[PDB]
């Protein structure tokens, strides 16, 4: 028996922080700068994050912008839920197997392993052909993360449009950025360089820029601008390109789609969304 | 396949011009029902020409989604207002099924979403505050707006009523709202003149229209506070009837236009400014 909604998410700071539970199985009581308690949820997920390796599901602690949004949605709409982290650790692309298949969170939502995707999930054409997206909860774009002192104008910098084995740039595998570089004919030369250096996760890529292993990381500005504000050794460069929104993902037949979007509009209009932005995204 | 479409003039999103015998250039025909007198219902549809950012989006959708349309300008209200549970404006025309869709500077909001289906947003908007350069105001949260009588003389600020801006201020800042009504403006042009003739200190309105107007202001005197900052952020969307069969293809086409760079081109053509 269970009418509990299965929620899928991904580790992506400051939207979703993933931490180990305490030895008793609970979440450490933490507070914001405002003195308010950090709302935290139990999220099951694999410990061996390595590809093609056995996945051992363990309870973990999940909090952040996306967790507070879920909690507000669950309260507004009156639904019960259980959160888990995407087994393969990916956002989701459609790949050729003649048959085609969705991987990542997309795959889980379409297989029925999830009933809702609550994460910084990009709203694009490819995904919208198969799932219902809510009205966006955030509007942002793509930017470039580099180690401080690296001079790059942006996406139209010669070190990017004319690729070399010297200057190595990348994004995350099976992500919306990957989709974008693969579909756009103008970025074909850029995608061929990228496909060789793309990372399993944004955390692996951000670490690789820190370790001088990767020179430029092309990713979500909501994530990059936060990361550069915390790790002052890393800097974002240039202006935003391919502006896009983040939204809640559901299957086309979902009976919650109308109320998920209404709740997101109410939250934009009453300042709740701006309050989440201030608590999690806006750091000096 | 031949759709009744409603629009409303608001530069640069929808610009209305007089006819040449027909409509030339990037203009599309748009009719306006004009009354014979104000003591009768009798009137005539005047043939006009329509252009703008939103008209270019409609031209691209008609080609991509494959539909033809009869475009008309709304005469019963403006964007949309619920009066004793009865909607007027572009929202009302869709609700009472006189139009299959509404195209223009139409703000997505929760109460309009209860009665109409909205496309994905295609223009970023919200509420902005316009002032003459040098007016010390943080945003809508400023005590000059929140508690206006704490100041001598009090801050003079208003909006154009009956739209999504006034509705949001009414729902969030009840004191500010009841105070603002004496500064209600007939339209954007009257508001900008009141700011320049020192008769108004601040004009609160749709972020996308204010940013366009600031970017074109002769001498660059009128500015949007912050970096053209947006409170209660939302977007313009196409309104369609609830359960509309057109929504799917319209969203997919809009997402394709952003992806291809067609949307950035339209922003360059219609929205960029000098200031
Ligand atoms: C076709 C896909 N749309 C876009 O890529 C897009 C624009 C091109 S302009 C714009 N503006 C918002 C602003 N916005 N709009 C809303 C809402 F809820 F009203 F939909 C919330 C927020 Cl953030 C969101 C958004 O995705 N876009
Ligand atoms: N775009 C607004 C009109 C202007 C405003 O009230 O800010 C609306 O759809 O209501
Ligand atoms: Ca369900």
Does the annotation list B112 as a binding residue?
yes
Give the CB-side neighbour count of residue A17, counting CA atoms within 13 A: 17
Range of the domain at A181: 140-247
User: Are A157 and A222 part of one and the same domain?
Assistant: yes
Q: How far is CA B255 from the centre of its chain?
A: 21
Asked if the peptide bond before residue A85 counts as cis, ω within 30 degrees of 0, the response is no
Give the CB-side neighbour count of residue B220, counting CA atoms within 13 A: 4
Does the annotation list A176 as a binding residue?
yes
A184 close to B (CB below 8 A): yes
Does residue A12 contact residue A278 with C-beta atoms inside 8 Å? no
Measure the CA angle with vertex B105, ends B101 and B106; round to 5°.
55
Q: How far is CA A1 from the centre of its chain?
A: 31
Secondary structure, 3-state, chain B: CEEEEEECCECCCEEEEECCCCCCCCCEEEEEEEECCCCCCCEEEEEEEEECHHHHHHHHHHHHHHCEEEEEECCCCCCCCEECCEECHHHHHHHCCCCCEECCCCECCHHHHCCCEECCCCEEEEEEEEEECCCCCCCCCCHHHHCHHHCCCCCCEECCCCCHHHHHHHHHCHHHHHHHHHHCCCCHHHHHHHHHCCCCCEEEEEHHHHHHHHHHCCCCCEEEHHHHCCEEEEEECCEECCCCCCHHHHHHHHHHHHHHCHHHHHHHHHCCCCC
β-bridge partners, B236: B107, B123
User: Are A114 and A220 part of one and the same domain?
Assistant: no
**Kind plus residue range of the DSSP H or E element containing A119:** none
β-bridge partners, A85: A9
CA distance B206 to B105: 9
Using the CB atoms, write b or e for A117-147: b if 16+ within 10 Å.
bbbbbbbbbbbbeebbbbbbbbbbebbbbbb
Q: Quick check: helix, strand or coil at residue A120?
A: coil
Does residue B37 contact residue B133 with C-beta atoms inside 8 Å? no
CA distance A215 to A194: 12
Helical segments of A186-271, H only? 188-194, 202-210, 221-230, 257-269
The pair phi, psi for residue B223, each rounded to 5°, is: -135, 160
β-bridge partners, B86: B83
Does the annotation list B201 as a binding residue?
no
CA distance A65 to A119: 9
B106: its two tokens: 């139409």
User: Are A148 and A259 part of one and the same domain?
Assistant: no
Report which bound ligand comes closest to the CA of B264: 1
CA distance A244 to A224: 15
User: Are A129 and A267 part of one and the same domain?
Assistant: yes
Beta-carbon neighbour count of residue A255 at 10 Å?
Answer: 7
Give the experimental resolution in Å: 2.4
CA distance B50 to B17: 6
CA distance A77 to A69: 12
**Kind plus residue range of the DSSP H or E element containing A172:** none
**Minimal C-alpha gap between B120 and chain A (Å):** 7
Q: How far is CA B117 from the centre of its chain?
A: 17
Measure the CA angle with vertex B38, ends B32 and B39; round to 5°.
130
CA distance B61 to B58: 5
Q: Domains in chain B, please, with CATH?
A: 1-125+233-271 (3.40.190.10), 126-232 (3.40.190.10)
User: Are A105 and A214 part of one and the same domain?
Assistant: no
All residues at 6 or more sequence positions from A214 whose CB lies less than 8 Å from its CB, including other chains: A168, A169, A170, A197, A199, A205, A208
Calculate the dihedral angle through the C-alpha atoms of A10, A11, A13, A14, rounding to the nearest 10 degrees.
50
User: Are A56 and A106 part of one and the same domain?
Assistant: yes
Hey, of B226, B232, B263, B271, which one would you mutate to test binding to chain A, going by the most A CBs within 10 A of its CB? B232
Give the Å distances, CA to CA, from B230 to B20, B206, B224, B248.
39, 9, 9, 29
CA distance B80 to B247: 20
Beta-carbon neighbour count of residue A58 at 10 Å?
Answer: 13
Strands B117-118 and B68-73: unpaired
Does residue B171 contact residue B82 with C-beta atoms inside 8 Å? no
Q: Quick check: helix, strand or coil at residue A180?
A: helix
All residues at 6 or more sequence positions from A273 whose CB lies less than 8 Å from its CB, including other chains: A137, A138, A264, A267, B233
Calculate the dihedral angle through the C-alpha atoms of A220, A225, A227, A231, rounding to the nearest 10 degrees.
150
B150 close to A (CB below 8 A): no
Give the Å distances, CA to CA, from B118 to B105, B231, B246.
13, 21, 11
Do A135 and B256 make contact, defined as CB atoms within 8 angstroms? no
CA distance B84 to B81: 10
CATH code of the domain in which A273 resides = 3.40.190.10
Nearest in space to B75 (alpha carbons), one of B46, B39, B32: B32
User: Are A101 and A39 part of one and the same domain?
Assistant: yes
Does residue B105 contact residue B13 with C-beta atoms inside 8 Å? yes
A45: its two tokens: 């997920």
User: DSSP character for A173?
Assistant: T
Beta-carbon neighbour count of residue B37 at 10 Å?
Answer: 7
Question: How many residues in chain B?
Answer: 275
A 188-227 near B (Cβ less than 8 A) = none
Does the annotation list A263 as a binding residue?
no
Measure the CA angle with vertex B71, ends B65 and B77; round to 5°.
120
User: Are A60 and A4 part of one and the same domain?
Assistant: yes
CA distance B36 to B95: 27
Closest-CA residue of B relative to A139 is: B124
CA distance A9 to A43: 9
Does residue B166 contact residue B181 with C-beta atoms inside 8 Å? no
User: Are A72 and A5 part of one and the same domain?
Assistant: yes
Give the Å distances, CA to CA, from A131 to A90, B31, B173.
17, 38, 37
Q: How far is CA B119 from the centre of its chain?
A: 15
User: Are A168 and A82 part of one and the same domain?
Assistant: no
**Minimal C-alpha gap between A167 and chain B (Å):** 27
**Kind plus residue range of the DSSP H or E element containing A5:** strand A5-9
User: Are A107 and A19 part of one and the same domain?
Assistant: yes
Does residue B200 contact residue B191 with C-beta atoms inside 8 Å? yes
Burial degree of B249 (CB within 10 A; 0-12, 13-18, 19+): middle
Count of the separate structural domains present in chain A: 2
Q: After which residues is chain B broken (C to N over 2.5 A)?
A: 20
CA distance A89 to B66: 39
Among B110, B172, B259, select the one facing A265 at the smallest CB separation: B110
A197: its two tokens: 């250096």
Give the CB-side neighbour count of residue A245, counting CA atoms within 13 A: 24
User: Are A61 and A183 part of one and the same domain?
Assistant: no
The pair phi, psi for residue A213, each rounded to 5°, is: -70, -35
Closest-CA residue of A relative to B114 is: A262
B51: its two tokens: 């252009």
CA distance A82 to A92: 21
Give the CB-side neighbour count of residue B71, counting CA atoms within 13 A: 24
Does residue A109 contact residue A251 with C-beta atoms inside 8 Å? yes
B120 close to A (CB below 8 A): yes
Strands across the sheet with A169-170, in order?
A169-170, A216-220, A138-147, A234-246
Report which bound ligand comes closest to the CA of B104: 2
**Minimal C-alpha gap between A27 and chain B (Å):** 33
Q: Which residues of B touch A273 (CB under 8 A)?
A: 233
The residue whose CA has the least distance to atom 6 of ligand 2 is B163
């Amino acid at each position: 028996m269970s009418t509990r909604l299965k929620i899928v998410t991904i580790h992506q700071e400051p939207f979703v922080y993933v931490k180990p539970t305490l030895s008793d199985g609970t979440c450490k009581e933490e507070f914001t700068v405002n003195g308010d308690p950090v709302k935290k949820v139990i999220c099951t997920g694999p410990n061996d994050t390595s590809p093609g390796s056995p996945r051992h599901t363990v309870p973990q602690c999940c909090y952040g912008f996306c967790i507070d949004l879920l909690i507000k949605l669950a309260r507004t709409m009156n639904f019960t839920y259980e959160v888990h982290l995407v087994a393969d650790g990916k956002f989701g692309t459609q790949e050729r197997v003649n048959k085609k298949e969705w991987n990542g969170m997309m795959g889980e939502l379409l297989s029925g392993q999830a009933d809702m995707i609550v994460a910084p999930l990009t709203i694009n054409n490819e995904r919208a052909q198969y799932i219902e997206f809510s009205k966006p909860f955030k509007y942002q774009g793509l930017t470039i993360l580099v180690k401080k002192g690296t001079r790059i104008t942006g996406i139209n910098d010669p070190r990017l449009r004319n690729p070399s084995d010297k200057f190595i740039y990348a994004t995350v595998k099976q992500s919306s950025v990957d989709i974008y570089f693969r579909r756009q004919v103008e970025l074909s030369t850029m995608y061929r360089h990228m496909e060789k250096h793309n990372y399993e996760s944004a955390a692996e890529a951000i670490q690789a820029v820190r370790d001088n292993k990767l020179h430029a990381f092309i990713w979500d500005s909501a994530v990059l601008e936060f990361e550069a504000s915390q790790k002052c050794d890393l800097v974002t460069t240039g202006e935003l390109f391919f502006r896009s929104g983040f939204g809640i993902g559901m299957r086309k037949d979902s009976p919650w789609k109308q109320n998920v979007s209404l709740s997101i509009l109410k939250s934009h209009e009453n300042g709740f969304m701006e309050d989440l932005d201030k608590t999690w995204v806006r750091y000096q | 396949n031949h759709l009744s479409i409603v629009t409303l003039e608001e530069a640069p999103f929808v610009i209305v011009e007089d006819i040449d015998e027909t409509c030339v250039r990037n203009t599309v025909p748009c009719r306006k029902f004009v009354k014979i007198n104000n003591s009768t219902n009798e009137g005539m549809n005047v043939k006009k020409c329509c252009k703008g950012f939103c008209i270019d989006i409609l031209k691209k959708l008609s080609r991509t989604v494959k539909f033809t349309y009869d475009l008309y300008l709304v005469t019963n209200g403006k964007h949309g207002k619920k009066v004793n549970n009865v909607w007027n404006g572009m929202i009302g025309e869709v609700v009472y099924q006189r139009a299959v869709m509404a195209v223009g500077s139409l703000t997505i909001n929760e109460e309009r979403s209860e009665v109409v289906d909205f496309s994905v947003p295609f223009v970023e908007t919200g509420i902005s505050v316009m002032v003459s350069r040098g007016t010390q105001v943080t945003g809508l949260s400023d005590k000059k707006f929140q508690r206006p009588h704490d100041y001598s003389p009090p801050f003079r600020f208003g909006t154009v009523p009956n739209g999504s801006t006034e509705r949001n201020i009414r729902n969030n800042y009840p004191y500010m709202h009841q105070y603002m009504t004496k500064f209600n403006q007939k339209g954007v042009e009257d508001a900008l003149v009141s700011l320049k003739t020192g008769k108004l200190d601040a004009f609160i309105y749709d972020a996308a229209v204010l940013n366009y107007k600031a970017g074109r202001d002769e001498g660059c005197k009128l500015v949007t506070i912050g970096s053209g900052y947006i409170f209660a952020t939302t977007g313009y969307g196409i309104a369609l009837q609830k359960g509309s069969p057109w929504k799917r293809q319209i969203d997919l086409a809009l997402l394709q236009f952003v992806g291809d760079g067609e949307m950035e081109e339209l922003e360059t053509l219609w929205l960029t400014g000098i200031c």
